[PDB]
């Protein structure tokens, strides 16, 4: 897994075979996992393009990773979606998982559509941000933002 | 590439904010109010770079999530520290050596 | 004489295919097709002795599972990694000592 380093306010990357002793790790607090929303990358934040980026897939188990820090989203998505028979496309939110804390706009989309699969993944591969918990799959009735996570080392004390 | 130079981040400081008085669960804050706000700006290299790095990390991280059978992986951050220490300290540390960090 | 010299193993992939496009879960393979296969053979000692290690390890491992209240413990291997560093660098490291890994 790639690891970025910050020395005197400019991030350089430290490759794994390479070894720098000058770099200092004092504590675990220095290390951090951060989610970043897609809004920053200039992708379209409107609903029609967003519903197009997401897609359903089966045979693939869900995976969850934690991120301590996250970014304020101008756009947040909450999903309630059912089929013509009334069955639910997305699973109920598991325990310990909550919606995105900071959302300027929460778009609610409710309509019927074909469920072709058991779970929902991002086609581009972006994680769905939640409260400090990133999932590759969408959950019902939970505000989320589209984003990706990185791990960095902070030189807080020298 | 369109990059947002302004970084407005919400997070939960560990010792950052050891204010106290909220540990007690009855009177502790609600899930919505626990978070703290911060802003990093006036830097073109770091903010743009952070967005990029997460973007590249998604690959190795995805292969990692698929590989591990745990539904939720919180042990990702700790492994890097282990590798960091093992890379220097794990081998026999020879004084005045390339892998070893000892200086007289 | 009951040992199976041959070893046909199914396993996970760490860095096998770091091509950069199967990591996405949507176009990624199903849970069933992700595993890799490998074979180790024509070695009597290496193969037969190992079934033996796991077989004996089961003993020490069980008491640990009983001891830990965690329903699922993924940290055993990693704890062992912790212990490795602790046995050597945990205590004052003396040059040319029996415990310390330091050579002039």
């Amino acid at each position: 897994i790639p690891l970025g380093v910050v020395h005197n306010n400019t991030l350089q990357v430290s490759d794994i075979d390479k070894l720098v002793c000058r770099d200092k790790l004092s504590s675990t607090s220095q290390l951090a996992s951060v989610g970043l929303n897609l809004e920053g990358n200039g992708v379209a934040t409107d609903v029609p393009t967003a519903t197009k980026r997401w897609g359903f897939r089966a045979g693939v188990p869900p995976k969850v990773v934690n991120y301590e820090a996250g970014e304020w989203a101008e756009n947040c998505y909450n999903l309630d979606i059912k089929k013509a028979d009334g069955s639910e496309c997305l699973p109920e939110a598991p325990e310990g998982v909550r919606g995105f804390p900071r959302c300027r706009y929460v778009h609610k989309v409710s309509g019927t559509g074909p469920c072709p699969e058991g779970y929902a993944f991002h086609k581009e591969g972006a994680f769905f941000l939640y409260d400090r918990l990133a999932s590759t799959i969408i959950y019902r009735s939970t505000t989320f933002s589209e984003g990706v996570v990185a791990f960095l080392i902070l030189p807080e004390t020298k | 590439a369109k990059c947002n130079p302004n970084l407005h981040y919400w997070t939960t400081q560990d010792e950052g904010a050891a204010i106290g008085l909220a540990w007690i669960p009855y009177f502790g804050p609600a899930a919505e109010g626990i978070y703290t706000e911060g802003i990093m700006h006036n830097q073109n290299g770091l903010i743009c770079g952070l967005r990029q790095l997460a973007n590249e990390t998604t690959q190795a991280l995805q292969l990692f999530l698929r590989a591990t059978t745990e539904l939720r992986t919180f042990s990702i951050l700790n492994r890097k520290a282990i590798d960091f220490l093992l890379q220097r300290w794990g081998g026999t540390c020879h004084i005045l050596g390339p892998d070893c960090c000892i200086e007289p | 004489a009951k040992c199976n010299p041959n070893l046909h193993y199914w396993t996970t992939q760490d860095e096998g295919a770091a091509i950069g496009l199967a990591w996405i879960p949507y176009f990624g393979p199903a849970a069933e097709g992700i595993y890799t296969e490998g074979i180790m053979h024509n070695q009597n000692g290496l193969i037969c002795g190992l079934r033996q290690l796991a077989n004996e390890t089961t003993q020490a491992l069980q008491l640990f599972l009983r001891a830990t209240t965690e329903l699922r413990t993924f940290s055993i291997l990693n704890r062992k990694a912790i212990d490795f560093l602790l046995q050597r660098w945990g205590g004052t490291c003396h040059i040319l000592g029996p415990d310390c890994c330091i050579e002039p």
Partner: antibody
Amino acid sequence: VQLVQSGVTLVQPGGSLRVSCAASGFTFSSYAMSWVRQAPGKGLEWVSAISGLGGSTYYADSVKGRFTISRDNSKNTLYLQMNSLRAEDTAVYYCAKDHRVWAAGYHFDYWGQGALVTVSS
Amino acid sequence: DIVLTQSPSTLSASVGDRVTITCRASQSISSWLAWYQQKPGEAPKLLISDASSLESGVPSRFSGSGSGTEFTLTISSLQPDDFATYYCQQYYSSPTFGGGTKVEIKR
């Protein structure tokens, strides 16, 4: 938006050689670079890749042992340090840049002219 | 791992002829595919990406199609600059190149 490989090079078995791919006319660090070798009368073969940032390096099964790829975003330069060379590794090496994806994928639009490396000894 | 294959290795054609090369992968790599062009002694040149989207600066006559396991490169009209070796690449797995289809005018 032009790339410049090494002009001419000659080596021996198990020898060490550096191929330098200069990049200019467009932003470097933004994109991820890779090497591709072409043996005479043979199809192209993927050699090594490095992330746009440089944190992740990737090598092929055949070459993972004896090759090393590295980059400097400041000099806008890509170095391929080649060690333990073999006769099979004798080829024209091309250094390319990404077609559409930004440090996400390994597409190639613009190719270098190629750098000749001969291990015949 | 995964290796793709080409049907015409050498295809005898003439100027302005509709030309179709068929490249079928062993596994199903969906829509992720690319086509290249290499003239003798010249660096490989990008023809098409994602099998649907065309690169800029590229002549409009060339087109590509197919999904999953099947793919087809079609040229409605052939030109003097089209006689070079053509390969197919899939990014789903190990970066891999096809045998190549060389174009000739030995009618």
